[PDB]
Amino acid sequence: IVCHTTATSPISAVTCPPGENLCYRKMWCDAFCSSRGKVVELGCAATCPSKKPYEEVTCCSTDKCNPHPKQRPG
């Protein structure tokens, strides 16, 4: 499967060769609670854990199914 990520210059996107092809959408509070905004990290996992600790996480298993919310309809 395909997958997005947040790491290089712009948004990164690669395919997950192993069994872990799930695209998670992690998001917590980084300045939106303070001043700037909520944090967002796009990645590829196999055992998408629970975001209960103190954040969010959308576990999906489709080609680059981890797109951005505020960033997309530019």
Partner: peptide, 25 residues
């Protein structure tokens, strides 16, 4: 010329205020 690895920080709220991280010695 340099180019590092992969480091980002995308904040929900604003698209014109992206936090990019590539290289900075």
């Amino acid at each position: 010329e340099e180019r590092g690895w992969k480091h980002w920080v995308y904040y929900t709220c604003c698209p014109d205020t992206p936090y990019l991280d590539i290289t900075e010695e």
